[model samples]
Target: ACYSSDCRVKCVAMGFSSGKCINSKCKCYK
Candidate 1:
């Protein structure tokens, strides 16, 4: 399972607005 930090960091790295780690899945916002 991915950590919340990883999800958030990954989102920012991908140039997204933010991130939400749902069920250990990295989800992002615009």
Candidate 2:
């Protein structure tokens, strides 16, 4: 998914700790 900074942050804050989508997987960081 094309996630904006806010969306990424919100996801993490909500306990969706995995951030930044890469290669169809959610990576915590680059």
Candidate 3:
């Protein structure tokens, strides 16, 4: 899952290693 407001919950699983979602492009889910 990519970094997004909806993925905020999942992003925690990554330990916030990944930076904030810029333009909504980030792997929030493993």
Q: Pick the candidate with the highest TM-score.
A: 1
In model 2, which residue pairs have backbone atoms overlapping below 3 Å?
A: none
Tens-place lDDT digits, model 3, residues 1-30: 454654665577667643446565655533
Error of 1 at 15 (Å): 0.6
lDDT of 3 at 24: 53
Please provide, for model 2 over 1-30, each residue's C-alpha lDDT reduced to its tens digit, 9 standing for 90 to 100. 655565578667777764675675445642
lDDT of each: 0.87, 0.61, 0.55
RMSD of each: 0.9, 4.2, 4.8
* C-alpha lDDT of residue 12 in model 1: 93
Instruction: Please give the ranking of all candidate structures by TM-score, highest first, separated by commas.
Output: 1, 2, 3
How large an RMSD does model 3 have?
Answer: 4.8
Predicted structure 2, TM vs. truth: 0.43
For residue 27, give model 3's deviation from the true position in Å: 6.5
Model 2 scores worst on lDDT over the 10 consecutive residues at 21-30
lDDT of 1 by residue, 1-30 (tens): 878888888999999988988886889987
Error of 3 at 14 (Å): 0.9
The segments of candidate 3 whose C-alpha lies over 4 angstroms from its true place after superposition are 1-6, 17-30
- Global fold similarity of model 3 (TM-score): 0.28
RMSD of 1: 0.9
